[PDB]
């Protein structure tokens, strides 16, 4: 037997950082969960019990804290690139670093109409994420994403004209509820290294904001012919607005809300145009994916 | 042996309702999870296999949907009271109904600065809840709550002057992070029945809003001497602003963020006044409770 | 306003302990999660910011580890009693301690048919729990429980003869699937103090084993007329076999498995006597409770 | 823009099936959660709102139930292959089916030392899984796995001789606790189609059993030099015992249990050879992966 692939590291490293403005007194907090896995010339730790090639996972944990102390942690694309570059430069035998970062929301509180200098609220479970792969001699590949953005519209969604055969019971509809949890990922052009990532820093937050804005507006305004058709429209617009993105991927559950026929009870009318009370379904759910690129 | 207490019913009944304004075209959605347990002269279903006394739990589920179709579902204190009253009036042998309702957030989206007529976002996992106990001959007892409101402040929290003995290692502090998930419950004066609950309908939403507002402002503005001291201040203000509340209860975790000493690494300074990077602790946590009433 | 009730402490304290037999070389592990909340003359910490009355929650955490180092941790009823007694005896102003313990399964592995001296498997998510309330001058109240015991039987469950009215759609049945997660609690006679708890130590493990055995046998063998009827039979037998128990409480979900009519597809027969494929329902579920005592 | 990849289908489809032996009266249950995603000539549903190419996800759900009614559901490798083959054969424009199946444990109860004909217990959260990719013209690729197998050993694990630099604080150790949740995957040789999968049916259950047995024995018996070294030994043995497997992959968290220094309290000795009470750490954790193949 032989080792065909191997990677190892530390997962679920929770990190908080505060910035304190000396002048204004305003404080800003960042909280993330970080995972770092390394690859390189480490096969002998598996095959011969040779621990001399292992950077201990505890040391990786230490490095994440030290790196956060010495560098900005925002935007996460930059922090991930700094952290990954560290490992491949510091250790001769380590040739790839894979860094995943989940950013948690701490939104500044408004009290009596003005922003508070040091108080924050978790205003949603929505996350902003990055996956950064730093590979020696091949640059830095970055995928940025948002996830856990849960939306619903109560009308202006249709679903008709689908294939019907002996396996089909679903009725065509011209008015249904549409609800999903949005997972959207944009993949950047390969960067040659840390200098190039630094040159594009302002684009990272701006592109996240654009992706979020396009997602929400398109969902609200599209008279949706299907999940497939609406998600394509979102991805098209994101690629149009940021030339440094190569592909956009959406993965969307279709979270079903079923009509409840109540006619059995005193002829009560609760279906079609009369539908007011619905039963949300926990499972099963549709799952619709697409990756859109440039032609 | 004898049956000392018994209750039974349906849990985890998910309900959605939409209201459609005919004039304006604006739609508003409500989504809840409902649990209803009944008590009464039902002992023989346990002791003698006598099912004739059982309102089937499936029928309770049907009743929740029918009741939601025929009545407003907001404020939840009113809906819960209507639903509980139904069971005790409809069935001679059922003498108590216990209704719990969890309300999920569907907040109207703003698109290009204006509110969308039919699109919504789950803008937080914070819940608004009610527990309603309808007991034949003893009226209606209502506890209203908010939960899952997660906050953090980065300074203006202290903790010093506590008992020190041979079990104490904790250092006194004049500046720490304070973070919690707020669970706050206000218990109303007993109501004689459904007419009295209806007479107070406008107070329910207003009191929820006040409780939320007082919680957030007090947390942001109090230079906190302890969790105990700050939570007392919140409860005091709520009782002062709504005379129909008899007690307020808070249950608050103290979610710890620990300093990380980095001095072992090149004399790096990251503690006390120099602390920038912290390690959030998933467990254990402090848990602090108090019920405040009128003197 | 006035403090009507208050308690505070540490939650989610994870503890592991190992015992190493010097002779045989056999090791045995225990893992628990512990919560301790105290009550007493502590109102001034809430009302006047007087921290001098507070045993810091960090110190409570320290005490749990020290107590586990110096005492046996099994049976959990004994460990909880020792831990609660400590707080009320050590601190003059603390008059009640409330200790909850969840025990996690680490079952010894059999390798090649024999028991391994030091290797363990989490063979189920089933828990054994205790709640111990130690109140100065009023002794020690102990409730022991098992929870998270998930079972299913595929036949020998019936449900017919229930109340039918204009809210009823459910069909009577003489053969259905029955599945539940068992939560069973037995409450001991009040003990005068730690000496009395020590005198009954052998009864604690034996009663847990009996409760488990009666639950499983009754479920497997009863041709069930309803959840209500079967659970009563379980509780009756437990009270009969241990005179030091005053009450038994069961709380049982009815986790539904629905028939799927497939007749629309080529006349396929999948209902009644022909039912083979079912759809498990995640929600809603029945919830059935009963507390049985001595007559 | 252009569609670069697309797949869609139904997730979280819960299925139960019962087999009833007419002679013996013995019943056997199977419960699974199934996900099916399709690929093919479906781009126009995204780009032109052309629903004529869409097999509705509701119809996929129907097909899973029908297929389970007409075919055996065990071993899951066979059921997944039948289900995937159906879609590519039935629909001309669908060219790939991806089927994931999670099998839940329903273990037959022993009552009074003998096996019960119709009663079952969920004896662990451990799962048996399959991923089956059926691609038109390229056969059937099957990855089988077990997951959620949680183990701990209290001694006979070491970790010393690792790289030490200015980022290292971890002390070398010759005796520590080792605990993990095992995720192991074995990938089969490509099969030409359903006839070939049928020819190997007996190997599927036997190989799962072997993989489980090797995992448990190796973990219990290896005086572990590192997670890396022990996991390699497991994978080596599995490949040796089943020639139809091409690769084995393990993904293993290192779930840390930390010593607690209690010397601050009355010189209490709880570290090194005196360590009895430990603090399990919820996070962070090591994460160690390896894919082993044939040389
Ligand atoms: O938008 C949808 N796309 C689909 O593929 C589908 N299948 N059922 N409902 C559906 N809705
Ligand atoms: O506010 C606090 N109250 C307490 O009781 C406590 N114990 N440790 N830290 C603490 N903080
Ligand atoms: O055992 C049962 N008890 C009940 O009260 C009930 N209601 N629906 N199905 C039921 N089954
Ligand atoms: O087995 C281990 N492998 C590792 O890479 C490691 N790092 N810290 N502890 C460890 N244990
Ligand atoms: Na390198
Ligand atoms: Na009544
Ligand atoms: Na005392
Ligand atoms: Na095809
Ligand atoms: Xe969508
Ligand atoms: Xe607080
Ligand atoms: Xe039961
Ligand atoms: Xe391992």
Residues in chain C: 295
Largest distance between two CA atoms of chain D: 78
Name the active-site residue from B10, B61, B95, B255. B10
Task: Reply yes or no on whether A247 is catalytic.
Answer: no
The position carrying tokens 């448990």 is D216
How far, in Å, CA of D224 to CA of D232, rounded? 11
Q: Are C258 and C279 in contact (CB under 8 A)?
A: yes
CA gap D136, D130 in Å, rounded: 19
Rounded to the nearest angstrom, the distance between the alpha carbon of D40 and the centre of ligand 8 is 8
Give the span between the Cα atoms of C232 and C227, in whole angstroms.
9
What residues sit around ligand 6, an ion, with C-beta below 5 angstroms? B 88, 94
- Contact (CB, 8 A) for C271 and C283: no
C273 SS3 class: helix
Q: Which of C29, C151, C156 sits opposite D121 (nearest CB)?
A: C151
Report the alpha-carbon distance of residue D191 to residue D80 in Å, rounded.
13
Please state the residue numbers annotated as binding site of C for O2. Answer: 57, 254
Provide the 10 A C-beta neighbour count for residue A35: 20
Nearest CA to ligand 9 atom 1: A227
Going by DSSP bridges, is the β-strand pair B127-135/B94-104 parallel, antiparallel, or unpaired?
A: antiparallel
Find the catalytic residue in A61, A98, A255, A256.
Answer: A256
Peptide bond into C284 cis (omega under 30): yes
For residue A266, count CB atoms less than 10 angstroms from its CB and return exposed for 0-12, middle for 13-18, buried for 19 or more. exposed
Residue of D nearest to B262 (CA): D167
| Beta carbons of D43 and D37 less than 8 angstroms apart | no
Pairwise CA distance, residues A252 & A227, whole Å: 8
Residue D95 half-sphere exposure toward CB, CA atoms < 13 A:
9
Instruction: Please name the residues in contact with B157: beta carbons below 8 A apart, sequence gap of 6 or more.
Output: B175, B176, B177, B178, B223, B224
Q: How far is it, in rounded angstroms, from Cα C13 to Cα C62?
A: 10
Output the CA angle D188-D191-D192, nearest 5 degrees: 170
- CB pair distance less than 8 Å for C167 and A264: no
Running DSSP on this structure, what letter comes out for residue C229? H
Per CB-CB distance under 8 Å, the chain A contacts of C166 are 265-266
For the CA of C8, the nearest atom of ligand 2 = 5
Q: What 3-state DSSP class applies to C210?
A: helix
Cα nearest neighbour of D280 on chain B: B283
C-alpha–C-alpha distance, residues D127 and D145, integer Å:
8
Cα Rg of chain A, angstroms: 24
Residue indicated by tokens 């639950």: C215
Closest ligand 2 atom to residue B229 Cα is 1
Q: For this experimental structure, what is the resolution in angstroms?
A: 1.8
Pairing between strand A114-121 and A285-293? unpaired
Within 10 angstroms of residue A202's Cβ, the number of other Cβ atoms is 9
Among the bound ligands, the one closest to the CA of C39: 7
Whole-angstrom distance, CA of residue B48 vs CA of residue A261 = 36
Question: In degrees to the nearest 10, what's the CA dihedral of D241, D242, D245, D251?
Answer: -40
Composition of chain D by helix, strand, coil, percent to 5: 30, 40, 30
Strand partners, B100: B35, B131
Cα A200 to Cα A178: distance, rounded to the nearest angstrom: 37
Nearest to D75 by CA among D34, D96, D43, D103: D103
Q: At CB < 8 Å, which residues of chain C contact A?
A: 166-167, 169, 264-266, 282-283
DSSP characters for B194-230?
HHHHHHTHHHHHHHHHHHHHHHHHHHHH--BS-HHHH
Helix (H, G, I), strand (E, B), or coil: what is residue B69?
helix
Interface test with D, best of C63, C154, C221 (most D CBs within 10 A): C154
Neighbours of B62 (CB within 10 A): 20
B136: tokens are 């034949």
Ligand lying nearest the CA atom of residue A134: 5
CA B224 from centre of chain: 23
Quick check: is B57 catalytic? yes
Whether the CB-CB separation of D69 and C268 falls below 8 Å is answered with yes
Measured between CA atoms, the residue of chain C closest to residue A261 is C169
Q: Is C10 a catalytic residue?
A: yes
Distance between CA atoms of residues B180 and B255, nearest Å: 6
Domains and CATH numbers, chain A: 1-295 (3.10.270.10)
Residue A118 half-sphere exposure toward CB, CA atoms < 13 A: 22
The tokens of D84 are what? 């995937």
Interatomic CA distance for residues A50 and A44, integer angstroms: 5
D84 φ, ψ (degrees, to nearest 5): -65, -45
CB B138 within 8 A of CB B165: no
DSSP state of D234: H
> How far lies A164's CA from each of A171, C46, D36, in Å?
10, 67, 19
Phi, psi of D277 (to 5 degrees): -110, 130
Beta bridge partners of A170: none
The number of the ligand 1 atom at minimal distance from the alpha carbon of D58 is 8
- Spatial CA neighbour of C14 closest among D179, D223, D226, B251: D179
* Cβ–ligand 11 contact at C180 (below 6 Å): yes
Angle of CA points C168, C170, C172, to nearest 5°? 120
C-alpha distances in Å from residue D177, one per residue of A60, C80, D220: 20, 26, 12
- If DSSP states are collapsed to H, E and C, what string results for C41-57? CCHHHHHCCCHHHCECH
Cross-chain CB nearest to B153 (options A118, A123, A150): A118
Here the tokens at position A67 are 């790196």
Residue C216, token pair as written in the block: 């499983």
Q: How far apart are the first and last CA of chain A?
A: 43
C53 near C93, Cβ under 8 Å?
yes
- Please, what is the Cα angle at B178 between B172 and B182, to 5 degrees? 135
Q: Using H for helix, E for strand and C for coil, what is the string for chain A?
A: CEEEEEEEEEEEEEEEEEEECCCCCCEEEEEEEEEEEEEECCHHHHHCCCHHHCECHHHHHHHHHHHHHHCCCCCHHHHHHHHHHHHHHHCCCEEEEEEEEEEECCEEEEECCEEEEEEEECCCCCEEEEEEEEECCCEEEEEEEEEEEEEEECCCECECCCECCCCCCCCCECCCCEEEEEEEEEEECCECCHHHHHHCHHHHHHHHHHHHHHHHHHHHHCCECCHHHHHHHHHHHHHHHCCCEEEEEEEEEECCEEECCCCCCCCCCCCHHHCCEEEECCCCEEEEEEEEECC
Cα atoms found within 13 Å of the Cα of residue C184, Cβ hemisphere only: 29
Q: Which residue of B has its CA nearest to A113?
A: B217
Q: Which residue has the tokens 């973990």?
A: D219
In whole angstroms, what is the distance from residue B51 CA to residue C168 CA?
A: 14
SS3 D105: coil
Judge contact between D136 and D87, C-beta under 8 A.
no
Residue contact D266–B166, C-beta within 8 A = yes
Cβ(C29)–Cβ(C23) below 8 Å: no
B84 vs A195: CA distance, rounded Å: 66
Phi, psi for residue A237 in degrees, rounded to 5: -70, -40
Which residue out of A28, A57, A74, A247 is catalytically annotated? Answer: A57
Burial class (CB in 10 A: 0-12, 13-18, 19+), B21: exposed
* Contacts for C111 with CB less than 8 Å, ≥ 6 apart: C119, D216, D217, D220, D221
What is the rounded distance in angstroms from the CA atom of residue B138 to the CA atom of residue A189? Answer: 70
What does residue D189 show for φ and ψ, rounded to 5 degrees? -45, 140
Beta bridge partners of B40: B94
Length of chain B measured in residues: 295
Alpha-carbon separation of residue B199 from B128, B194, C38, C148 (angstroms) = 21, 9, 41, 44
Answer for the pair B254, B241: CB distance below 8 angstroms, yes or no: no
- Copy the structure tokens of residue A3: 């080792």
Structure tokens at D90: 């039935």
Q: Which residues have a Cβ under 8 Å from the Cβ of D222 and sit 6 or more positions away?
A: D156, D229, D230, D233
Residues with CB in 5 Å of ion ligand 8: D 88, 94
| Per-residue DSSP letter, D176 | -
Q: Are C128 and B20 in contact (CB under 8 A)?
A: no
Do the Cβ atoms of A20 and B275 come closer than 8 Å?
no
Q: How many whole angstroms separate alpha carbon A226 and alpha carbon A236?
A: 16
- Going by the DSSP 8-state scheme, the letter that residue D113 receives in this structure is T
Peptide bond into D288 cis (omega under 30): no
**CA gap A240, A234 in Å, rounded:** 10
| Calpha distance A185→A143 (Å, rounded) | 6
Experimental method: X-ray
Residue positions counted in chain D: 295
- Judge residue D62's burial from the number of C-beta atoms within 10 Å of its C-beta, 0-12 exposed, 13-18 middle, 19 or more buried: buried
Over the range A116-134, which residues count as b (16 or more CB within 10 Å of their CB) and which as e? bbbbbbbebbbbbbbbbbb
Distance D227 CA to ligand 4 centre (A): 7
From C76, C78, C126, select the one nearest C106 (Cα to Cα). Answer: C126
Residue D241 DSSP SS3: helix
- Supply A192's token pair: 């040659």
| CA C85 to ligand 9 center in whole angstroms | 59
Nearest-5° angle of CA D21, CA D22, CA D23? 95
Contact yes or no for A60/A84 (Cβ under 8 A): no
> What is the crossing angle of helices D201-221 and D76-90, to 10°?
140
At D232, phi and psi to the nearest 5?
-65, -45
Q: Residue D7: enclosing H or E segment and its boundaries?
A: strand D2-20
CA distance C111 to C120: 11
Q: Which residues pair with B13 in a beta bridge?
A: B34
The one-character DSSP state at D53 is G
* Dist CA D236 CA D214 (whole Å): 10
Write down which chains contact chain D via at least 3 CB pairs under 8 A.
Answer: A, B, C
- CA torsion D269-D275-D277-D282 (nearest 10°) is 130
> Could you tell me the two tokens for B130?
């009610």
Q: Where are the beta strands (DSSP E) in D223-284?
A: 245-254, 257-259, 277-280
Cβ proximity of A260 and A274 under 8 Å: no
In Å, how far are A50, B4, D158, D210 from D30, measured between CA atoms? Answer: 44, 39, 41, 21
Which residues on D lie below 8 Å from C279 (Cβ)?
14-16, 65
User: What are the residues facing C134 on neighbouring strands?
Assistant: C97, C140
**CA atoms of C233 and A151, how far apart (whole Å):** 48
Residues of chain B contacting D267 with CB distance shorter than 8 Å: none
Q: Element (H or E) spanning B120, and its range?
A: strand B114-121
> Which of A93, A85, A104 minimizes the C-alpha distance to A12?
A104
Peptide bond into B284 cis (omega under 30): yes
Identify whether the C-beta of residue D256 lies closer than 8 Å to the C-beta of residue D285: yes
Task: Report the residue among C56, C63, C87, C94 best suited for mutation to probe ligand 2: largest number of ligand atoms under 8 A from its CB.
Answer: C56
One DSSP character per residue, C109-151 reads EEETTEEEEEEEE---S-EEEEEEEEETTTEEEEEEEEEEEEE
Give the DSSP letter of residue C173.
Answer: B
A23 CB burial (10 A radius; 0-12, 13-18, 19+):
exposed
Burial of D217 (0-12, 13-18, 19+ CB in 10 A): middle
Alpha-carbon separation of residue B105 from B68, B149, B250, C108, C202 (angstroms) = 18, 12, 21, 47, 51
């Amino acid at each position: 037997s032989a080792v065909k692939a191997a990677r190892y590291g530390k997962d679920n490293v929770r990190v908080y950082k505060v910035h304190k403005d000396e002048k204004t007194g305003v404080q800003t907090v960042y909280e993330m969960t970080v995972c770092v896995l390394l690859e390189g010339e480490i096969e002998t730790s598996y095959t011969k019990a040779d621990n001399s090639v292992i950077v201990a996972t505890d040391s990786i944990k230490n490095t994440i804290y030290i790196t956060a102390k010495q560098n900005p942690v925002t935007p996460p694309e930059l922090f991930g690139s700094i952290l990954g570059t560290h490992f491949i430069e510091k250790y001769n035998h380590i040739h790839a670093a894979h860094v995943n970062i989940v950013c948690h929301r701490w939104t500044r509180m408004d009290i009596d109409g003005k922003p508070h200098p040091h108080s924050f609220i978790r205003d949603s479970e929505e996350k902003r994420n990055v996956q950064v792969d730093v590979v020696e001699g091949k640059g830095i590949d970055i995928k940025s994403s948002l996830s856990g953005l849960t939306v619903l519209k109560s009308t202006n969604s249709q679903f008709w004209g689908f294939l019907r055969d002996e396996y089909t019971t679903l009725k065509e509809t011209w008015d249904r509820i549409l609800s999903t949890d949005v997972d959207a990922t944009w993949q950047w052009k390969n960067f040659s290294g840390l200098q190039e990532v630094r040159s594009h820093v302002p684009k990272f937050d701006a592109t996240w904001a654009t992706a979020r804005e396009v997602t929400l507006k398109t969902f609200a305004e599209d008279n949706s012919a299907s999940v497939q058709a609406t998600m394509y429209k979102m991805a098209e617009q994101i690629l149009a607005r940021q030339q440094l993105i190569e592909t956009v991927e959406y993965s969307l559950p279709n979270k079903h809300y079923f009509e409840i026929d109540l006619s059995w009870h005193k002829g009560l009318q609760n279906t079609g145009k009369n539908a007011e009370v619905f039963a949300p379904q926990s499972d099963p759910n549709g799952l619709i994916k697409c990756t859109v690129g440039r032609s």
